[PDB]
């Protein structure tokens, strides 16, 4: 209960999916008792691969990386839904928009779950929860793009 993480919300923008990573901790090894950051799916992938390529960690039961969420389908339907707004009736536009939202909702619930469980499993691991890069993932305010390139 010293390190608790959750994902209260998520966002699909273009081809990127952003997760809000919310952390409540009693550990003074973190600068703040409560904080939130924004992380893309790529950051989760980077976190996992960084742990596995740490030679000291080789052998540890490392939880599997969350798989890439698939929004290609819904994104296509949504935009093509959008073009036909003028042409489309004002009665079925909300019909299959609500059906589109439901399609997004199904994908979101699943991928948020996989991403959250991944982080929660890392928090309960006696070795991995103290990792420097895991710390950065949870606490570092700015975008991880540059630290993923160096």
């Amino acid at each position: 209960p010293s390190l608790q993480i959750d994902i209260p919300d998520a966002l699909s923008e273009r081809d990127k999916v952003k997760f809000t990573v919310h952390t409540k901790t009693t550990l003074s090894t973190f600068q703040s008792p409560e904080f939130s950051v924004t992380r893309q799916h790529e950051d989760f992938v980077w976190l996992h691969d960084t742990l596995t390529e740490t030679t000291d960690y080789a052998g540890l039961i490392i939880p599997p990386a969350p798989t890439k969420p698939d929004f290609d389908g819904p994104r296509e339907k949504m935009q093509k839904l959008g073009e036909g707004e003028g042409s489309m009736t004002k009665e079925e536009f909300a019909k299959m928009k609500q059906e589109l939202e439901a399609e997004y909702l199904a994908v979101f619930k699943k991928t948020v779950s996989t991403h959250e469980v991944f982080l929660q499993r890392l928090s309960s691991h006696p070795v991995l929860s103290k990792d420097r890069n895991f710390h950065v993932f949870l606490e570092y305010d700015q975008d991880l793009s540059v630290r993923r390139k160096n």
Binding site: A10, Y104, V112
Partner: peptide, 21 residues
Amino acid sequence: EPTVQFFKGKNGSADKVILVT
């Protein structure tokens, strides 16, 4: 072009998505 925003449901509320304008 637009973005879709997801919100986890709290206090028994249902999770939902919002098509952002």
